[PDB]
Structure formats: structure tokens, C-alpha cells
Amino acid sequence: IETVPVKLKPGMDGPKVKQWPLTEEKIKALVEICTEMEKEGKISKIGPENPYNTPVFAIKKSTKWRKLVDFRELNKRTQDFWEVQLGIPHPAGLKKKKSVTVLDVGDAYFSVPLDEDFRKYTAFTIPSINNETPGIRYQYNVLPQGWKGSPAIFQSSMTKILEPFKKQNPDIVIYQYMDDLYVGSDLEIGQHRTKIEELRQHLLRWGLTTPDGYELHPDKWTVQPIVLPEKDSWTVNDIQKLVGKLNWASQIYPGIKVRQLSKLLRGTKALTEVIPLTEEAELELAENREILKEPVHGVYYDPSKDLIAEIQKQGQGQWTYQIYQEPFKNLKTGKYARMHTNDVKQLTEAVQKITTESIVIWGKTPKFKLPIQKETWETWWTEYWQATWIPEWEFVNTPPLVKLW
Amino acid sequence: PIETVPVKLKPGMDGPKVKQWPLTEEKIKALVEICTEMEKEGKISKIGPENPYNTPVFAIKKKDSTKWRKLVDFRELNKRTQDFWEVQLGIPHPAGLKKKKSATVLDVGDAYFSVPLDEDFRKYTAFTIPSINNETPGIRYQYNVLPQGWKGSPAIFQSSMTKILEPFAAQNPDIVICQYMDDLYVGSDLEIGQHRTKIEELRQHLLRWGLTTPDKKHQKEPPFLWMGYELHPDKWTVQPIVLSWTVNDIQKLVGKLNWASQIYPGIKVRQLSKLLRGTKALTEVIPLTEEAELELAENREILKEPVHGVYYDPSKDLIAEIQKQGQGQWTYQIYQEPFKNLKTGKYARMRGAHTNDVKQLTEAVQKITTESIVIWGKTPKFKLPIQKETWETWWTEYWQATWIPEWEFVNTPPLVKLWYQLEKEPIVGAETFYVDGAANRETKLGKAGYVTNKGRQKVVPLTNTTNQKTELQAIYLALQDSGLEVNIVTDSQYALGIIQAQPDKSESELVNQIIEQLIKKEKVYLAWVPAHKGIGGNEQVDKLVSA
Ligand SMILES: N#Cc1cc2c(Oc3ccccc3OCCn3ccc(=O)[nH]c3=O)cccn2c1
Ligand SMILES: [Mg+2]
């Protein structure tokens, strides 16, 4: 019954973010959901003296619709102060586990009440078509689902609920990132799935509903190493590209030599002309291959800094990505295959996969550099989004020339 | 009664304190008449000297013309008053309206004065009536209702009106009620008898809350003169638009042209907009351009033919069809039935240079898509002048994620196409040009050239060129002196980028020359090499131009 008082960071006003226009199916979904939430006391109507607003969308993971609030601005103003006061530890064992299943614990928050002096900052608007009516305005009376403050406040009761299960299963690792429970075990998949249902029954008995992205396997995850081509005959063009790729790798890997290989191209030769590799340059090539074979070392995750994600579209539905905090020091690199289907759908799936990996590995989400025109992304990203969180993103309109994975 | 919205001032601010300016005694008496009347109806109340706050009071002296009015400047009170949830700036578009059997406009009278003001805030609205003689102390009042100039009256009136309407809307869901400032537009498909019945029920229901409606005279004239439009029961259009012009006369002309482009297809404003560059003085005249004057002549011809838009039918698909009209300019129509348009519009290129007609087409589809969701709540089906093979080739090879909704080719020229395609692999038996450029930052002069495998070489001296212009000019030279099949090797990351983006046209004259050479070639391969690494002829051309 007691409400944890919540304050904003000093010198910060509440969020004032415009509601993006919605489709009629999405609006109708939102009114259904919010009517029932209003009946249940979770949200209530607000007057014009409340100037704040936070975007709201409807996604469908589940034929039934589900509401998603974009609390990114409120989090930038609350969570950072709230993360120091009430932080959540992150286990380095989650990445080690063989299987991790992700459960939605969002219904848990709706029982704990929110401090009344904070509720106004949780204002959102259901928009109207063609501006024929004013937007329906609500604010939260209970802990909001996407708010990074919500798991922080509920953390105490979450630890009580999970204690019997953790006693009965000391091997399983359980991590809470906002709205989700990450449950890692090294059991057999059929045994792991059985334990998950036991955990779901446990939470249900204690009054946490979970719905009826998942089944992740962190130990199968491995980096995408830099690979030089291996040919029997090399055109001048082939060597030029090899020198350019090897020149590129010099920034990430110290010790890359392009001297002998550059000597092969001395003079003004035709691109098609095959070049026999000198024995010295064959040594320089193989030396760089072994340097690129062994994994990179000396990059340490810095929790004070921001993770950032870059994504390049390759063909055939292939996408590559790099996660870093410093420009040429990559914490991870990967590549995705997409079983063409919409580029945008492929991209939104990639962003969700990367974020999930970055939550498991670091308990942090990266800020994405999305290679897509902002308006296209803002119109259609919601059509394929299935996650309870939303990462930070910017847009790059400048093509990366390298495309060297 | 009506519930008050609790209002507050900004955190570090206090109520206004402004001394009223002296006013003519004829007006002063008229102000006394207005305020005594408002005192009678409960809208204002006389304030004692305990209230310190004051705001300036003006007036217009009573006359046959509408000059018998009380004005109050609340600008300082507004600057001290909190922010509110802004009432929506977007105005309902007629092409999103659904035709109803009948539609009545009910405007509210004394709308702001029918809603009470928060009592704790009333003190700040205090105003002092001027004294006829300077020796007389002035009489002072404060508002008990929403003041007409106050920052919070629009939004507090809107929210109060929503709460009053909620039961009746629940009671009668077939009836569609639209809200706009001080107005209620009520439409239905009931029989004419029942429609006028529910209006009176609504008219009576608002009166119980103190809101007066134009029940006797409904402005029932089916053609409504609303916000620049004509709303007929069967159609909508724009209000008539009036066709030597100084700089400001151009700006209002372009505005009226854009307003006309909602429904009149083919309105063009690009030439006039280029004329309206800089020249911030409205008084200064703009020189008339024959091409710009032609633009007005074509527009006048279009405006002669009356155009009407149709209202929206939720049961039919929205079709959007786009035409590339002119360079950088696009026009589009939106319709459900083959020749009856819901509305019209235009789209123009972004500011950036080195664009592609395919990029522009995709962006235009993007613009129309967002417009549709705002107006109708769904996206349209598209009819576009681009082959499916052109688009598929473009999307598969384009570094960005791109998408367009379902669309059908329309064989209406000008067709959108790719003027050239670069080769993915080097061309055998085609001469290989190693190009480079260089220039001095202190002296704008520079050089550019190439060296090839066949021993060909060239250097040309340049004036007023940057390093990037030279690197781009060096590629231009190689194309000019090459056969139909050429391989070019450059170190310029900048030049690679411009050409890789496959621009159709550009603002820079050099890039246009490059595109036209590319179109004339049969095969071009461009390859990039690291600079200053002793690679190939890159080192040789580096010395040939930087020496
Ligand atoms: N003064 C004015 C005015 C009227 C309206 C307005 O009227 C409607 C109200 C509810 C439902 C459908 C409506 O109109 C549907 C379209 N329509 C409009 C006018 C008419 O006579 N018949 C008709 O079907 C809507 C929006 C802005 N307005 C401005
Ligand atoms: Mg150089």
C-alpha cells in the first residue's frame, strides 16, 4: 500500500513527446485496452493542466493486441537517478548458460501503486483520426510497464516471490531487465522447458500472470572474425581489395603488414592482370591471416559509457553488426540470416536480436545507428516489433564504403 | 455547475502587476456598463484592495459596428501561467470526412464565460477599471470564468466540453460529433426527422450545463464556408482563390497556390520558390522571370476549371497515384473511384544534392503514406510510374533498408528509371585509369589527371577548386578520354561515395557532367585504393598532380 516516492533528476521537466499518428485498427485496440485498464484503476483520465505526454503504440506478438508505451524520454530523466538509488545487479553467468528463456512479467507491476506526485509524468494520449476529436488522455496510477523505474521498485517483492523456486533450483540463473525475466539453465531442453512451466506456475500461485525472443542459446553465440579471401590466382584488383581490407583491419588489429603485398602492385598495371604472389608477400598474407584468426583482446566493457550498435545491410537477407563503446574496439560482432521479405521487417528483427544479446551479455541496451530513412522507420517499425522494450536509435544516411563485414 | 481545472502559475513566477493606462472617459463608462453586466451574470466579481495583482484593461467604444467590446491583455499573466496540454493544431481535413445524411453546425456562445475558473487562480486575473478623474480610485474586478485572452481558456474549454459530451455520445453512438474551437459539428445518417430530434436533445443537454447553441438559426446552409473550404453535402472544394507583384505578393501567392494544390492538380510553385530565396525585405521587389511568369500562366489556366473533392468511403480502397512532373517535382492524387479524387498534392525534393529519381519516388510514397494515416487511418494502395524490375534492382543493391507498400505499375511517362549501373567486377581488356587530384588550400588553384596501363597520361591545371573538386574532376577527365569500357581507380573516398549513390542529377555542375559521361558509357568499373600506400599507379598519379 505504501508508495515509493519517485523524483525526477533535478533541473529536468517531465517528458513532452508528440504522439505519432496511428492506424484505425491500432487506435481501436488502444481504446479497448485503456477502457478496461481505466475500469481496473490502473490508469485514469487527466485534464489539460497536465502538459506532459509520452508516445503509445499497439503491437501484436498473440492475435490479441497489446499496448506498448515508449517511456524512453521518461527513463532518460528518471531511471538514471533511479538506477543508482535502486539498481539491479547483472550476472555474468547468464551469457554462460546453455539455454535462456525470456518471460513477460509486466503484469507484476500493476499491483504496486505509483507515487502520486509522479503520476502526471506518465501521461499518454490515444490519438484521433483526421483530428475529428481531441486525444483521449490518461496517466498511470500503478507502476508503468515500460518505465525503468518499475522493476527497480518491484525488485524487493520480485526477490521474495522467486526465493522458493531459487532454493529448489540453485543452478538456474534469473535476471530481470525491465518487464522481462531472463531464466538461464544448463538442463536438457525438455527439462529446461519443464522447469520454465514450474516457474510460471510458481509466479501464478503468487499472483504474477505471464502470457501463454524466447529459447535463446547464449553458449552457441560466437563472434564474426575477419576473413581474407583465399584464391589460387590474384588479379591486380584482387590484391588492391586485399590491401584495402588489410589496411582497414589495421585499426582494429595491431600488427597488420601491407608492405610486401603493396609491392606486388608496384607500377601502373591493368586490373584484370593476374599477379603471381611473391614468396615474401605470401608470408605477409599468412602472417596477417593468423593475426586475424586469434580473437581480439584488450576490450573491456565500461558500464559508465554507452553501448552503440551499427548495422550494415548485405544482400540475400544478410545483415552484419558491431557493438562497441569506443570506435575501433568492438565488444561483439555478428551476422544474421533472414529466411524478399521487407527490408524493414528484417531490420527490426535484427535490432531486436541485438538488443536481446546485449541485455543477456551486459544488462544494457545499445544505441542503434539504423541504415534507413527516419520516416520509413518511424512509420513501419511498429508493424513488426514484438519486444516489451524499445532501444535508442539514430539514423545514418551515409553509406559505409567498406562492407567488409 | 461545471468542475474547475486546478490551475497553477510557473514555479518561480508570481501574478501580474501592471498599472492600467489612462483611457478616454467615453470608453471608461462603456467599460463600467460591460463590467456591471458581467457582475450580474456571475462572470466577474469586484475585488478589494487586498488583491495586489493587476492586468491592463482596454476597450473599444460602443458603436453600430462591432466596436462595443472589452479587451484585456493577459500577456504577462500568460507568461506567468503554467503550460497546458496544447489543443491540437491539426485541422480536420474535408477529404477525411464521411458523407452523412445530414450535418449541422452548433456554435457555442460565450463559450469561455460558461466555464468557471479555478478559484485559487482567479486572483491573478484581477483587472482595474480606469477612473474618469485621476483623483478617483479605480474600481477593480476579477474573473470567475475563463478570460478571453488567457493562455488556459482554449484547453480548459475543450476538456470541459469533452466531459459534458461523453454521456450523450454514449447515449447516441450513431451520431458523430466533431469538436473544433467553440463549434460542434454533428452529423448522422438518421432520417431527417430523427436527426433534428437528437440535435434538440443535444441542444437541450448542453443548456443544462450552461452552453447556448444556435437552435433557432442553425446556419443549416449545406455549403459551409469553413476554414478556407466549401463543405457541400455531396462534395468539398477550396474557397475561390484570387489569381505586378512585390516580394510579399509572391509569398501570399505561393501560399494560395499550395492551398489550391490540395484539390487542384498540377499547381506548380517551384520557380517562384527559387525566386523567394533570401531577400527578406517584403518591400524590395522581385524581378519577374519568364519561366516563373509562365508558371503563373499555367496555374491560372488550371484555376479556371472548377475542381471538387469527394468525401471518404470506409468500404473502398484508397488509391494513391504519383506522377513525376518536372525535375525534382512530384504530383500525386488520392481517390477511391476511378475519376473522383479525394484530394491532391505535391512533393518536392529534399535540400541535399546527388539524388536519384528512385530515391525521390520512395520518399514521396513515404510522404503520402503518413498523410493517409493522419487523414483516413490506413495506408493507400499505390500506382507508380516505375517498373517492378527497376525497383527490385534498386532495392536489392541499395545500402539502406527501403520498402514500399503494395503497388502496381502505371505506364504513364515520364517513367522512373536508373540512368546507369556500375559494374561489380573489373572489365577485361578495358584500359585502367589511375586518377588523382590535388589542390592548395591557400591558393585555390590545383591540378588533376590520370595515368593508364597503356602509358597514357594527362594533367590539366585548375583554378578555384578544392581538393574534393579535383578528385572528382580527375574522374571526369578519365571518362572523357576513355572508350566505351573503362576501369577507374581512385583513392578519393569522397568521389567514390557520390558515384556509388548513383545520382540521377545534381546541383553541382561537375557531377552532372560525370553522370552524362556515365550514361554514354557501356561499362564502367570504379575501384577504391588506400591513398599513400605505394599501390599501383595511385602513387604515380599522386606525384603527377601534387608536384
Ligand atoms: N460548418 C462546418 C463544418 C461541418 C463539419 C463536419 O461535419 C460533419 C460532422 C460529423 C460527421 C460528418 C460531417 O461531415 C461529413 C461530410 N459532410 C459535410 C457537410 C455536409 O453538408 N455533408 C456531409 O456529408 C465535419 C468536419 C468539419 N466540419 C465543419
Ligand atoms: Mg592524393
CATH architecture of the largest domain in chain B: 2-Layer Sandwich
How many distinct beta strands of chain A?
15
Q: Biggest sheet of chain A, in brief?
A: 5 strands, mixed
DSSP strand tally of chain B:
21
CATH class of the largest domain in chain A: Alpha Beta
Q: Residue share in helices of chain A? A: 25-40%
Shape of chain B: elongated
The assembly state of the depicted protein chains is heterodimer
Rg of chain A, nearest Å? 25 Å
User: How many DSSP helices of chain A?
Assistant: 10
Describe this structure in words.
- The complex is a heterodimer of chains A (405) and B (547).
- Chain A has 405 residues and is of the alpha+beta class.
- Chain A is 34% helix and 18% strand.
- Chain A folds into four domains: 129 residues, HIV Type 1 Reverse Transcriptase, subunit A, domain 1 (HIV Type 1 Reverse Transcriptase, Chain A, domain 1); 82 residues, Reverse transcriptase/Diguanylate cyclase domain (Alpha-Beta Plaits, 2-Layer Sandwich); 86 residues, Reverse transcriptase/Diguanylate cyclase domain (Alpha-Beta Plaits, 2-Layer Sandwich), CATH 3.30.70; 104 residues, Alpha-Beta Plaits (2-Layer Sandwich), CATH 3.30.70.
- In chain A, the strands form five sheets. A five-stranded mixed sheet of chain A has the order 13-12-11-14-15, covered by helices on one side.
- Chain A is globular, with a radius of gyration of 25 Å.
- The termini of chain A are far apart.
- The relative contact order of chain A is 0.11.
- Chain B contains 14 helices and 21 strands.
- Chain B folds into five domains: 93 residues, HIV Type 1 Reverse Transcriptase, subunit A, domain 1 (HIV Type 1 Reverse Transcriptase, Chain A, domain 1), CATH 3.10.10.10; 86 residues, Alpha-Beta Plaits (2-Layer Sandwich); 69 residues, Alpha-Beta Plaits (2-Layer Sandwich); 91 residues, Alpha-Beta Plaits (2-Layer Sandwich); 116 residues, Ribonuclease H-like superfamily/Ribonuclease H (Nucleotidyltransferase, domain 5, 2-Layer Sandwich), CATH 3.30.420.10.
- Chain B starts with 24 loop residues before the first helix and ends with a helix.
- In chain B, the strands form six sheets. Chain B has a five-stranded mixed sheet with strand order 14-13-12-15-16. In chain B, strands 19-18-17-20-21 form a five-stranded mixed sheet.
- The chains are: A alpha+beta (405), B alpha+beta (547).
- Chains A and B meet through helix 6, helix 9 and helix 10 of A and helix 4, strand 7, helix 9, helix 10 and strand 17 of B.
- Chain B: This is Reverse transcriptase/ribonuclease H.
- Chain B: Heterodimer of p66 RT and p51 RT (RT p66/p51). Heterodimerization of RT is essential for DNA polymerase activity. The overall folding of the subdomains is similar in p66 RT and p51 RT but the spatial arrangements of the subdomains are dramatically different.
- Chain B: It comes from Human immunodeficiency virus type 1 group M subtype B (isolate BH10).
